[PDB]
């Protein structure tokens, strides 16, 4: 009874007056431009729905609605990748011959000698190498023609307007109450049991009806053409039976608990394909079966409507003193008690976390991407292995910056002090002071002993005293502990003593084990660990840890500082508090996220670099009919990572001669997109080191010269405002710098990958 | 539909259809006419 | 420390009182706007040089000016 | 006379380019047009001299077409922004383009050229400097 | 000596530091009719006390933006006051300075640091070279 | 100048020098600057009214009628 739906009929008409009346949803913007900031305030507002109104039912009704808007955007993309992969495509060349053809998606019209950029990709085809992995995608989903990428491209587009309706529907026509969206326990029972665990359910059934049949007769060298349809494994039954002999046993041993039966297509192995390289499709079935059993269990968790489940109050108010364990109760008496009140009316808390969440699933999927390769033919296409790594390491770091800006927003706006009396938001806020200064010192500790060291190894080098250096033939600086770990897991499979025998092969052969190889290239190898992977992943602790200094500090200090004790009323955003108090600029949370996006990109930018080298020099290459293999780079990580002279001269500058030679040939797009990041990057460094009182006052002389023409405007020229100088500063500074990466990574691994 | 009349003539609906209105007429240009340079404009094809 | 100076354009707004975060400034009895009052500073020890009384001044030029000054210990706004 | 700049289809190494030139839309008929028309300097490449009496057309003609088209956009535009002084909002013409008013002012700048000399002799051109907002010495 | 009992609070890290007790101290003291939860100006929430109440701050600041944006803005208690206190033990009130806020006229408060001129009739630095005054300072 | 008349800024800080503004009201005290003027553009605080005495305007237009 207590969970029901409830909704208004028609709150909000549809009708295109308020599109003519730009600005209307701000108080302020609807009277109109006066000068040139009302048109940039009206696009930085348009979003911030809380500023709208201080209704949070009507605010809720904006997110949902808007939440169909972004689904259908994103339905229309994916249409757009099915259709240009159904029809400007060599899909089905690829498919024939998956290791001698480069995937391409793209092909460009011949008007200003552009066409230069349809590269030889092969299987007679002309276009832009895509490194997106979607023929690695689809091959693994048993698409085999561009017929049935050009159904699923149709689907996307009717989906896409299905979600279109969908948010018109259910904001001007069905608007949920306020209560419907607080069902804190009904919201996590369906996402969990019927969005996770009835997705990989439905994913596990394709996987074992259609993906893993049609790629068992690929991966052992049937013809395209000789492959049944994917509904002909479903009709004819004897097929399958064939394929797999558990088939001709039909449901008998599901139901009667005889499980083992169906070890043929739910298989266990562990390791990789020899054939492709990628995980075993049969092995993704079975992962994804037993996740969507367990995803369903968790989805009985909460108590809906029929009494039996747990609760999202009782469970929090329960996390207390001295309900916690012994060591743990340094929480107070109060403990988790009060933070059911964020849930129920923040918005932005929620967000925060989830933000958080999707850049730890992003991380996931890189890391574990490239070390269990799970489409067929993408270990050993190292373009799109690079590219695939790189662009879910950036996502994430985006997301990880957004999770700690909606917590700065949370805590100047949605935060009520009345709420939480001596709770742990309470007692953490109270010892703001001793979590900042720890952390601050743990990051001058972590950058001397990673950084400095690697200054000192500079200047040992350069002295022509190697000995002195901090490198394997020098001191040695062994990462004992991941040694040790990738030990243990690679006795676990049988390759402390066998922790889990089920598996037959490695479940990572980075770990150890042995080496995979496809078509003459490298899939995976053992990653050895020494005095440079010790070094770069102290950079990595070192720079993550600042960027938590930045954005932590920004948090906890939101509402106020010792120096501006009132910066809550200011607002979340705002430039400064004057050049009082020797000087108060960018102390708002804002700036907080402003400087965190800046260590954000400066510490992923060595996070990809680390893989790109390491992969390239350790795992990456070539082998012959005898098994040597010769790297990309040839080993150069070793002894030229350990020095960051090694990395301007056996990285930046060695690793850039594809990029920079790419001119008169189909790469030269990255030739030419590699000067574009870095025009953009010195572009932006005006916004950032200039200030808004100069610009100003030179459109004063430039509004003069308008004035004595009579062609001044009536909406006024204003320079930007100091938050949107920052703001432009550091996009256009990010934008720079992440393209200048793209396309020297896209250049050389198209060329040698 | 009156409002959507309006709507259509905002500064960047009307600057988003001159710009490519503009691109339009270049870029047919180039296929029409590619390589034209200075000292070759409205000069007969050899 | 600050120094804070009121000129004869005062017309009695008293918002840059209101804006001031350390109790600089108090409005006086005067004769020379229509609302009979103006801003004075007998307090500019206590001044941090923030400018939030500028920036709530409605009159065009400013009839209330902050002119930065030697640094003191509450000027700088230390709690330490 | 310039000795160092030969005429394209004499210069031994623009040919060099043209025969290596691959056979595309974007090769054949404009090499045909450098070779006859431009003229190349050692590195086979046309260059563009402004030391020569004769080609004077060659330069003046693209000259005087940007300057009509520059000068028919900020006619247009200045025309405009005059006709919506006049109006109670002038502000809100800015964002909202007035058809017919923009039509009227993109007729009449096809003759600016001889607007603009007219305003000028009238004095109408230009505000008259104590008329104009300016910041104290 | 200002009487007056202190808030609920559990302790934190914005309190006072060695200028307190080395320079100068503040303290805010105001009466509630309930008791009721604050916000402190250093961050954290205290709960006032049903009668008379007494916080020390570092910065007279935090007084002011206690009492003004909270005390009175929000739990319409017009009646604190802030206290400069000095190590030896001499307290003095400071805020509001006569009994009536600032914001409004009282009769008696004389002008301070009036200029008798508009801001654009301020003389050029080069009259008053060598002379030690400041053009806003000059008569 | 009376209320309705058409007036030009002579003071030089202000925002509105050599401009024009449009006198809103004039006050009959004794007050330092009695005269206020509305104006189409607002300056860099986006206030569009300012006071000002008489010797710092200059009378353009008549108030109509
Ligand atoms: C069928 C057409 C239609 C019409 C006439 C309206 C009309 C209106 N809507 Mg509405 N809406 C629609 C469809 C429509 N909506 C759909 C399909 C959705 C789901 C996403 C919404 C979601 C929605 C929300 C959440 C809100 C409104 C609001 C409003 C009112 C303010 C006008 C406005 O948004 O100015 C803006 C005018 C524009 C022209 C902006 C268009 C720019 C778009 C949105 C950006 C592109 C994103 C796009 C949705 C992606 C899908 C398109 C795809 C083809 C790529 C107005 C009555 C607001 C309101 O009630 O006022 C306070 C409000 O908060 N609508
Ligand atoms: C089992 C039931 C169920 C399922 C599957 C979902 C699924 C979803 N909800 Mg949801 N929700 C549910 C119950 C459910 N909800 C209930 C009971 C409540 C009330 C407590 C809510 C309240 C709620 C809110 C408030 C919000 C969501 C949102 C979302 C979306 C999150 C974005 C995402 O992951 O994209 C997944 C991407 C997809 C393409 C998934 C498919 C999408 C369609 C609509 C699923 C249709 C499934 C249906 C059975 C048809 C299947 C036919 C055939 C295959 C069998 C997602 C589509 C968010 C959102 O984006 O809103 C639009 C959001 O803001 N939900
Ligand atoms: C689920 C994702 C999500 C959602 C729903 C929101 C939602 C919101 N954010 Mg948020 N944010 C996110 C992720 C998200 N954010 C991430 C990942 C970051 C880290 C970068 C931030 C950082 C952030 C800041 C710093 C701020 C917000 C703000 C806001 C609020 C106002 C939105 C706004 O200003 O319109 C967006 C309007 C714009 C004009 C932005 C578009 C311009 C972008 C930067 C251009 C990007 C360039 C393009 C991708 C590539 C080049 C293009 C090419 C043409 C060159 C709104 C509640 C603001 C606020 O006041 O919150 C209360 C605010 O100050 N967010
Ligand atoms: C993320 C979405 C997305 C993106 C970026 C592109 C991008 C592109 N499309 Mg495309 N397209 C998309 C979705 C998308 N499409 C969808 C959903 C459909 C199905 C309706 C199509 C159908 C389509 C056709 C039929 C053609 C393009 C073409 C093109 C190219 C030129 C587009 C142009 O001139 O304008 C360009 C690379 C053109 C092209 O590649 O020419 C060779 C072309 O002929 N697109
Ligand atoms: C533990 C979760 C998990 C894992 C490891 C995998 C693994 C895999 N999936 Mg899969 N999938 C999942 C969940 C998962 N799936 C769910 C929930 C759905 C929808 C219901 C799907 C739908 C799906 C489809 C449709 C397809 C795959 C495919 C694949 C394979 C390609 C690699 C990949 O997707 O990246 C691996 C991903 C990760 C390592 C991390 C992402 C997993 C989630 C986001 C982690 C969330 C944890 C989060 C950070 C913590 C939450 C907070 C906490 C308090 C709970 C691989 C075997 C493809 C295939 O064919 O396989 C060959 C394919 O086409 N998946
Ligand atoms: C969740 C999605 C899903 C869907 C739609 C299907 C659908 C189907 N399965 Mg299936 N199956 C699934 C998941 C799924 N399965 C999983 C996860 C397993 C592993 C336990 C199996 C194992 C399985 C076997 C062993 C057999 C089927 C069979 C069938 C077909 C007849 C089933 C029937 O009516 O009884 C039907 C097309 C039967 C069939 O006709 O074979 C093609 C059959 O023999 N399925
Ligand atoms: C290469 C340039 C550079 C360097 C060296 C630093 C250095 C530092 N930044 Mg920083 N920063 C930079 C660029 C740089 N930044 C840029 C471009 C931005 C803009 C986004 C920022 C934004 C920024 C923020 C927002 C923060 C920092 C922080 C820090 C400190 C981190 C703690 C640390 O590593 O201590 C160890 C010090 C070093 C590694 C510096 C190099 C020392 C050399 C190698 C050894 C010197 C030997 C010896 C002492 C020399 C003495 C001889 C004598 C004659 C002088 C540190 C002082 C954080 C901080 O203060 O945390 C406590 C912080 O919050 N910075
Ligand atoms: C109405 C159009 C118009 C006209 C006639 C002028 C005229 C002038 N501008 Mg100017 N300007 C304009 C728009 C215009 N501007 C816009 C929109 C901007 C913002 C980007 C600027 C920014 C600008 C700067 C920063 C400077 C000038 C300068 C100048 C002077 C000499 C250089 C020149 O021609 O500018 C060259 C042109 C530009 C720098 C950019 C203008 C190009 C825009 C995009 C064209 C817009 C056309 C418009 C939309 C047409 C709409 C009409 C339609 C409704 C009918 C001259 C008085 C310079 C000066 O003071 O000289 C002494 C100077 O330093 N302008
Ligand atoms: C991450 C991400 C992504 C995505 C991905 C994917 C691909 C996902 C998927 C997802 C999915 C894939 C989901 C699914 C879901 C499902 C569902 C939700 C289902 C349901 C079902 C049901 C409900 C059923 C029912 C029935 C019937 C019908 C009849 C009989 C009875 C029964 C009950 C059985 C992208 C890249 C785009 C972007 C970025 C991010
Ligand atoms: C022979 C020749 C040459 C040279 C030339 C020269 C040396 C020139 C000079 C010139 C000059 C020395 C000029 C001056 C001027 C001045 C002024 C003062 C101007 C003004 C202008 C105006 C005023 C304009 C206006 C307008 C128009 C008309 C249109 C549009 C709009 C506007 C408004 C902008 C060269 C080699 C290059 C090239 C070849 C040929
Ligand atoms: C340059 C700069 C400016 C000046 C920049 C301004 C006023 C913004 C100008 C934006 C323009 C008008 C947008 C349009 C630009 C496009 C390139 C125009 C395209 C024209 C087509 C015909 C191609 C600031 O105002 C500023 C403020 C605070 C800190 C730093 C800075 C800063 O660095």
Redesign the pocket.
């Known amino acids: 009874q207590k969970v029901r739906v409830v909704v208004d009929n028609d709150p909000v008409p549809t009708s295109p007056e308020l599109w003519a009346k730009p600005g209307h949803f701000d108080r302020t913007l609807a009277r109109g431009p006066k000068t040139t900031t009302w048109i940039?305030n009206l696009?930085?507002?348009?979003?911030?729905?809380?500023?709208h109104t201080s209704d949070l039912e009507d605010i809720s009704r904006k997110?949902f609605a808007?939440h169909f808007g972004?689904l259908a955007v994103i339905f229309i993309w994916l249409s757009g990748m099915y259709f240009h992969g159904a029809k400007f495509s060599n899909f089905e060349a690829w498919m024939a011959n998956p290791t001698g053809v480069k995937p391409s998606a793209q092909v460009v019209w011949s008007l200003v000698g552009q066409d230069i950029l349809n590269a030889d990709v092969g299987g007679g085809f002309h276009g832009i190498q895509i490194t997106s992995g979607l023929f690695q995608l689809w091959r693994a989903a048993g698409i085999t023609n561009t017929f049935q990428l050009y159904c699923t491209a149709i689907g996307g587009l009717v989906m896409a307007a299905i979600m279109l309706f969908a948010g018109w529907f259910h904001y001007h026509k069905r608007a949920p109450k306020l209560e419907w969206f607080q069902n804190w326990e009904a919201m996590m029972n369906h996402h969990l049991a019927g969005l996770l665990g009835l997705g990989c359910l439905g994913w596990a059934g394709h996987q074992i009806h259609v993906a893993l049949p049609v790629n068992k007769l690929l991966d052992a060298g049937v013809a395209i053409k000789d492959i049944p349809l994917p509904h002909e494994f479903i009709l004819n039954t004897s097929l399958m039976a064939e394929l797999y002999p558990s088939f001709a046993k039909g449901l008998v041993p599901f139901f009667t608990l005889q499980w083992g039966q169906y070890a043929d297509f739910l298989t266990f192995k562990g390791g990789l394909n020899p054939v492709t390289g990628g995980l075993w499709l049969s092995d993704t079935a079975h992962h994804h079966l037993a996740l969507a059993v367990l995803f369903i269990v968790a989805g009985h968790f909460y108590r809906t409507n029929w009494g039996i489940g747990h609760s999202f109050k009782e469970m929090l108010d329960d996390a207390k003193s001295p309900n916690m364990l012994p060591f743990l109760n340094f929480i107070g008496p109060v403990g988790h008690e009060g933070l059911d009140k964020i849930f129920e009316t923040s918005?932005?808390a929620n967000?925060s976390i989830?933000?958080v969440q999707?850049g730890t699933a992003s991380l996931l999927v890189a890391h574990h991407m490239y070390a269990m390769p799970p489409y067929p033919y993408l270990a050993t296409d190292y373009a799109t292995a690079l590219s695939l790594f790189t662009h879910h390491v950036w996502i994430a770091g985006?997301?990880?910056?957004?999770?700690?800006?909606?917590a700065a927003?949370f805590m100047v706006?949605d935060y009520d002090p009345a709420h939480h009396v001596n709770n742990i938001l309470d007692r953490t806020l109270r010892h703001r002071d001793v979590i900042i200064s720890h952390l601050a010192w743990v990051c001058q500790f972590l950058g001397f002993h990673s950084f400095a060291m690697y200054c000192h190894n500079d200047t040992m080098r350069a002295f022509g005293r190697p000995q002195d250096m901090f490198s394997d033939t020098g001191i040695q600086l062994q990462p004992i502990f991941a040694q040790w770990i990738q030990h243990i897991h690679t006795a676990a499979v049988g390759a402390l003593g066998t922790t889990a025998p089920g598996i037959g092969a490695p479940v990572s052969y980075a770990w150890g084990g042995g080496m995979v190889a496809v078509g003459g290239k490298v899939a995976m190898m053992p990653i050895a660990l020494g005095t440079a992977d010790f070094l770069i992943h102290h950079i990595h602790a070192f720079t993550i840890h600042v960027t938590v200094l930045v954005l932590f500090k920004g948090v906890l200090f939101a509402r106020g500082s010792r120096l501006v004790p009132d910066k809550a009323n200011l607002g979340?955003?705002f430039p400064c508090d004057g050049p009082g108090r020797g000087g108060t600029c960018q102390v708002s949370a804002?700036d907080h996220?402003?400087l965190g996006?800046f260590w954000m990109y400066n510490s992923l930018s060595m996070v990809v670099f680390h893989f790109s080298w390491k992969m390239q020099s350790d795992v990456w290459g070539t082998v012959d009919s005898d098994g040597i293999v010769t790297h990309l780079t040839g080993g150069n990580f070793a002894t030229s990572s350990i020095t960051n002279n090694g990395w301007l001269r056996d990285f930046l500058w060695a690793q850039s001669a594809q990029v920079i030679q790419s001119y008169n040939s189909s790469l030269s797009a990255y030739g030419l997109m590699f000067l574009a990041g870095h025009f953009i990057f010195g572009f932006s460094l005006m916004f950032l080191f200039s200030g808004r009182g100069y610009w100003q006052e030179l459109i004063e002389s430039i509004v003069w010269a308008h004035n004595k023409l009579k062609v001044a405007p009536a909406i006024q020229p204003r320079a930007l405002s100091i938050?949107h100088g920052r703001?432009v500063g550091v996009?256009h500074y990010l934008?720079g710098g992440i393209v200048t990466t793209w396309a020297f990574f896209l250049a050389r691994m198209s060329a040698i990958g | 539909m009156q409002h959507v009349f309006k709507y259509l003539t905002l500064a960047p609906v009307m600057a988003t259809f001159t710009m490519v209105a503009l691109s339009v007429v270049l870029i047919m240009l180039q296929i029409w006419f590619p390589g034209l340079q200075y000292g070759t404009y409205f000069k007969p094809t050899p | 420390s600050h120094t804070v100076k009121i000129y004869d354009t005062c017309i009695g707004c008293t918002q840059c009182v209101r804006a001031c975060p350390t109790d600089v400034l108090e409005m006086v009895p005067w004769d020379g706007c229509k609302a009979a009052q103006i801003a004075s500073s007998p307090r500019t020890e206590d001044c941090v040089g923030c400018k939030r009384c500028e920036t709530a001044c409605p009159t065009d030029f400013l009839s209330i000016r902050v002119y930065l000054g030697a640094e003191t210990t509450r000027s700088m706004g230390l709690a330490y | 006379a310039n000795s160092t700049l030969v005429p394209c289809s004499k210069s031994p190494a623009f040919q060099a380019r043209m025969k290596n030139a691959p056979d595309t839309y974007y090769f054949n008929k404009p090499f045909k047009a450098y070779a006859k028309y431009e003229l190349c300097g050692t590195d086979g490449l046309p260059h563009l001299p402004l030391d020569r009496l004769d080609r004077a057309t060659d330069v003046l003609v693209p000259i005087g077409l940007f300057l009509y088209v520059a000068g028919f956009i900020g006619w247009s535009g200045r025309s405009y922004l005059r006709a919506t002084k006049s109006a109670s909002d002038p502000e809100m013409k800015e964002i909202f383009i007035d058809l017919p008013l923009a039509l009227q002012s993109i007729s009449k700048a096809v003759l600016w050229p001889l607007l603009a000399l007219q305003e000028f002799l009238s004095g109408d051109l230009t505000a008259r400097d104590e008329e104009i907002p300016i910041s104290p010495r | 000596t200002l009487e007056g009992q202190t808030p609920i609070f559990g302790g934190g890290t914005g309190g006072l530091l060695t200028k307190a007790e080395r320079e100068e101290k503040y303290v805010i003291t105001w009466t509630s009719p309930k008791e009721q939860v604050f916000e402190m100006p250093t961050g954290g929430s205290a709960i006032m006390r049903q009668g008379k109440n007494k916080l020390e701050i570092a910065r007279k600041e935090y007084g002011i933006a206690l009492g003004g944006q909270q005390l009175r803005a929000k739990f319409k208690i017009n009646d604190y006051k802030i206290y400069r206190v000095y190590p030896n033990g001499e307290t003095q009130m400071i805020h509001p300075a006569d009994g009536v806020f600032p914001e409004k006229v009282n009769q008696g408060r004389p002008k301070v640091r009036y200029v008798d001129r508009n801001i654009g009739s301020n003389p050029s630095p080069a009259k008053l070279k060598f002379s030690g005054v400041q053009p806003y300072d000059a008569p | 100048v009376e209320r309705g008349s058409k007036v030009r800024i002579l003071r030089r800080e202000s925002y509105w020098y050599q401009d024009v503004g449009l006198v809103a009201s004039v006050d009959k005290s004794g007050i330092k600057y009695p005269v206020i003027v509305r104006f189409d553009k607002v300056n860099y605080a986006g206030v569009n009214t300012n006071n000002f005495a008489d010797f710092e305007l200059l009378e353009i237009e008549k108030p109509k009628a």
Do not use: E
């Open positions: 940039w696009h930085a507002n348009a979003h911030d729905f809380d500023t997110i808007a972004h918005w932005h967000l989830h933000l999707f985006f997301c990880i910056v957004g999770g700690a800006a909606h927003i706006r979340f955003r804002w996220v402003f996006l938050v703001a996009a934008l």
